[PDB]
Amino acid sequence: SHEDMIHDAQMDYYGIRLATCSSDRSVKIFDVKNGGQILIADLRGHDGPVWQVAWAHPMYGNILASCSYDRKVIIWKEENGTWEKTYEYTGHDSSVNSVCWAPHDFGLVLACGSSDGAISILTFTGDGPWEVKKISNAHTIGCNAVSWAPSVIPGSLVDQPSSQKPNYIKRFVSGGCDNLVKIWREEDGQWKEDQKLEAHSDWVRDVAWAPSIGLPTSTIASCSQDGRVYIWTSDDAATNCWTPKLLHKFNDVVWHVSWSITANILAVSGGDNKVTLWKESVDGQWACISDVNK
Amino acid sequence: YSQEQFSEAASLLLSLMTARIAPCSFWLTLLLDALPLLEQKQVIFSAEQTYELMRCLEDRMAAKLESTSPDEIQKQDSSIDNTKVEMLRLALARNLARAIVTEGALQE
Amino acid sequence: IESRARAVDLMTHNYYELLYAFHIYRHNYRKAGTVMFEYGMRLGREVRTLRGLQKQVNSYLACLNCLRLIRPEYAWIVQPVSGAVYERPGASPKRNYDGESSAVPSSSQIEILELRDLEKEYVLA
Amino acid sequence: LPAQWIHKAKAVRSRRDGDKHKEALYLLKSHQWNQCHKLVTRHLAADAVINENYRYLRGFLGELARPEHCKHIQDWETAGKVYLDYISVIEMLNQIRQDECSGGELEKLHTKVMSLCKWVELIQCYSAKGRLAQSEMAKRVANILRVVLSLQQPPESMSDSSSEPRVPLRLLAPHIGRLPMPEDYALEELRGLTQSYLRELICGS
């Protein structure tokens, strides 16, 4: 199979097809069944090394996006058993590093950040245009990691019935390489400054939104190069109640954070060739409930 | 042609094209001149051989289009030349159809 | 003529090429190409000589000549499969050889044949 | 638990896997009227007309024809009940000959056929296969129209003695001339139209 080790690889909503992307310059795809699997494809195209892809929601169907070093994002849609290259964007000065789909409640818009110091957000009508939402000086240096708003999370919606549809304000988070993290809300047609966060005196590497189903509060696991893992939490941003807590003091450059598809636990890639499996215990504290030696 | 030597003219042309030599842009004019012979009531016309002529013509025009655009000049007469080429091949088809008709009416 | 042509043997005359020439007379490229292609079909079903191979080559040749005339909004043909035809008029009935299964009208047992497919076929021929 | 959600889920499942029967069934069952409309128009109409499986989409269009469904879908009137009309006329004319015919439905045949001739024009095909099914429809309607115009003078109960009536092509032509026609059977149709215009012009204005 792949000529270079895998950064990212994602199964579907249905567990029956797997996309696997390396910096090995191409991305290969298996059908998944019975425990067996046939490599159905190996999509080429990416004239920069590949890191990340992005699947979309099932009520839309089957949609993938990908970033590369060549400042190209390639956009793949599956037909008749054939995934193929549907939209592709470039115009970027530095390698496009972060791509992530928005909740289908907000729609078919991908977020696209790069260490350019600035970030675009691209909408696909699904048949039509690719609406561009480009924000310059988003960083004074560059963008490392970005996360959306997950669309629905407790805190004020208990009194809001299931029959109606609530207002969908757009917000999100990210952290860059100017030693800072930042928080954004969308209005006036554009995005403005929820929050500035300066606690990691070094560059932040990865960011983790706790899928706050059951949580009125807003919960962040921020991992930087400086070995400090901050759980940032605010019950209310309007009363400005974001506070840092230590999750773990790893002595390695702290790398990756990703919540479960089951939205229960967090996987943290450490400078140990390991992925620590942490769960916020039922009581009050964050316990590394398991590990995977990479 | 100039002394209207239809039989041996056509035989030579058949032999030459079966020899399969020279660039396409000129086989254009080749069959352009072959036109009135094809028009004339002649029984030696082997329509099937005429049609490897035309299928090679298709092959060559496809290759010509792939290798270059027939008209890189935008003028009132470039589209004239093009549509003239399609009309030419349409004339090829229609004249061959007539020749087949005459051949059959003579096979009686 | 089709009543006669189906009823009589093909080796006496190609009434199919006869009708094809009529098609040419009447400027009907669709029907002409279909006739010549189906006569190639009949030859392929019936005979297996290399002369016959040249013959189906000519058949498919002429059909795609009609293709040279066909308008893009019609780039396809129908072809239904059916049973055999009577042979030896003036002789006893039930004279049937080889043959093909009959189709089903309340469905689509017919085959629609377009540019690229038929040129695949002629290239292989 | 309301089967609305289960039909939603198995419907998107089917839209993933490609089981035509199942997407159609569960789209009907959950009544996504507009999108089910649009998808059936895209695919299912041609499928059923060319494969002659009128039963299923017959029930389909029948339940869709309910006026409230017409209210929640744009352009139901444009196509769906139109093809429902096609198929209904086809079946009833078939059965009227499956028994001994009665003019009390033959007159309705004439009235609705010559009318819907006026709206065959407004058929809009945005696909090659859509226009192909349109062509198949046109050729079949020409065939059945020839058959019925021949048989409306039944072989033992002739309607008119020997009269050659004036053809309603004076109304048919301005609308039938608005669509193209394949020269395969356009030949015979156009020839019949030739002798029609001959008498029409020898007896013109």
> Nearest Cβ partner of C107 from D51, D131, D132?
D51
- What is the distance between the alpha carbons of residues D23 and D12, in angstroms, rounded to a whole number? 8
DSSP per residue, A216-253:
SSEEEEEEETTS-EEEEEES-TTTT--EEEES---SSP
Q: Which residues pair with A121 in a beta bridge?
A: A111, A133
Percent helix / strand / coil, chain A, rounded to 5: 0, 50, 50
Q: What is the CA radius of gyration of chain D?
A: 20
Q: How far apart are CA C72 and CA C116, in angstroms?
A: 12
Task: Enumerate the H helices of chain A as residue ranges.
Answer: none
For residues A55 and A66, give the distance between their C-alpha atoms in angstroms, rounded to a whole number. 9
User: Measuring CA to CA, which residue among A154, A223, A150, A157 is closest to residue A232?
Assistant: A223
Q: Which residue has the tokens 């399609």?
A: B86
> Rounded to a whole number, what is the largest CA-CA distance in chain D?
73
3-state DSSP assignment of residue A98: strand
Inter-chain CB proximity D183 and C108 less than 8 Å: no
Residues linked to residue B86 through DSSP beta bridges, in sequence order: none
Distance (Å) from the alpha carbon of D186 to chain C's nearest alpha carbon: 10
Rounded Cα gap, residues B35 and D131, in angstroms: 38
Query: What is the CA A114 to chain-centroid distance, rounded?
Result: 13
Q: Which of D12, D14, D15, D16 should one mutate to test binding to chain A, selecting the residue with the greatest count of A CBs within 10 A? A: D16
- In chain A, the N- to C-terminal Cα span, in Å, equals 18
d(CA A16, CA A90): 31
The gap from C-alpha C95 to its chain's centroid, in whole angstroms, comes to: 21
Find chain D residues with C-beta within 8 A of C73's C-beta: 131, 180, 182
Q: Which two tokens stand for residue C55?
A: 């013959």
Could you tell me if D89 and D113 are in contact, meaning their C-beta atoms sit under 8 angstroms apart?
yes
Residue A129, both tokens: 């245009």
CB atoms < 10 A from the CB of B28, how many? 16
Query: DSSP 3-state assignment of D72?
Result: helix
State the DSSP code for D44: I
SS3 (DSSP) at D11: helix
> Rounded to an integer, what distance in angstroms lies between the CA atom of residue D161 and that of residue D155?
12
DSSP annotation of A108: S
**What is the number of other CB atoms lying within 10 angstroms of the CB of residue D38?**
14
Calpha distance D103→D110 (Å, rounded): 10
Size of chain C, expressed as the number of residues it contains: 125
**Judging by DSSP bridges, how do beta strands A6-11 and A143-147 pair with one another?**
unpaired
Report the interhelical angle of D103-120 vs D128-151 (nearest 10°).
Answer: 150
Residues of A in contact with D16 (CB under 8 A): 14, 58, 61-62
Taking Cα atoms as reference points, which of A161, A163, A172 lies closest to residue A133? Answer: A172
b/e map C93-121, b = 16+ CB within 10 Å: eeeeeeeeeeeeeeebeeeebeeeebeeb
Is the Cβ–Cβ distance between A135 and A120 less than 8 Å? yes
**Among C125, D9, A53, residue whose Cα is nearest residue B48:** C125
How are beta strands A63-68 and A73-79 bridged, if at all? antiparallel
C79 is written with which tokens?
A: 């072809």
Residue with tokens 């589209």: B79
Report d(CA A75, CA D145) in Å as an integer. 51
- Beta carbons of A151 and A103 less than 8 angstroms apart: yes
Q: What is the gyration radius of the CA atoms in chain C, in angstroms? A: 15
DSSP codes, C21-89: HHHHHTT-HHHHHHHHHHHHHHHHHH---HHHHHHHHHHHHHHHHHHHH--GGG--------------T
Which of B 30-59 lie inside 8 A of C, CB atoms?
48, 51, 54
The span from the CA of B89 to the CA of B55, in Å, is: 11
Token pair recorded at residue D40: 């059936």
Q: What are phi and psi of C107, to 5 degrees?
A: -150, -165
How does DSSP assign A148-211, residue by residue? ---S--SSS-TTS-SSS------EEEEEESSS-EEEEEEETTEEEEEEEE---SS-EEEEEE--
Q: In what order do the strands lie in the sheet with A286-293?
A: A256-259, A266-270, A274-280, A286-293
For residue A156, give how far its alpha carbon lies from the nearest alpha carbon of chain D (Å): 26
The answer to whether C108 contacts D51, with C-beta atoms less than 8 Å apart, is: yes
Task: Return all residues near D70 (Cβ < 8 A) that are at least 6 apart.
Answer: D76, D77, D81
C chain contacts of residue B96, beta-carbon cutoff 8 Å: 65
Q: Is A199 exposed, middle or buried (0-12, 13-18, 19+ CB in 10 A)?
A: middle
Do D174 and D204 contact (CB within 8 A), yes or no?
Answer: no
Q: Using alpha carbons only, give the angle A194, A195, A197 rounded to the nearest 5 degrees.
A: 170
Of A280, A258, A270, nearest to A227 (Cα)? A270
How far is Cα D53 from Cα B30, in angstroms, rounded to an integer? 55
Give the dihedral sign, CA D115/D121/D122/D126.
Answer: positive
Give C18-25's long-range contacts (Cβ < 8 A, gap of 24+): C18/B104, C20/C62, C21/B100, C21/B101, C21/B104, C21/B105, C24/B97, C24/B98, C24/B100, C24/B101, C25/B101
Judged by CB atoms closer than 8 Å, whether chains meet at D12 and A62 is answered as no
Rounded to the nearest 5 percent, the helix, strand and coil shares of chain B are 75, 0, 25
- Interface contacts (A, D; CB < 8 Å): 7
Q: Alpha carbon B79 to chain centroid distance?
A: 20
Method used for this model? cryo-EM
**3-state SS, residue D113:** helix
Q: At what angle do helices B78-107 and B47-67 cross, to 10 degrees?
A: 160
> How far is Cα of residue A244 from the mean position of the Cα atoms in its chain?
21
- Asked if A126 is an interface residue toward chain D (Cβ–Cβ < 8 A), one would say no
Give dist(CA A88, CA D27) in Å, integer.
Answer: 33
Residue D179 DSSP class: S
How far CA C26 is from CA of B38, C30, D187, in Å, comes to: 20, 11, 10
Spatial strand order in the sheet of A17-22: A6-11, A17-22, A27-33, A36-43
Q: Are A18 and A11 in contact (CB under 8 A)?
A: yes
Structure tokens at D46: 């041609």
CA-nearest residue of chain D to C26? D187
- Are the CB atoms for A9 and A25 separated by under 8 Å? no
Neighbouring subunits of D (3+ Cβ pairs under 8 A): A, C
Q: Which amino acid is at A189?
A: G
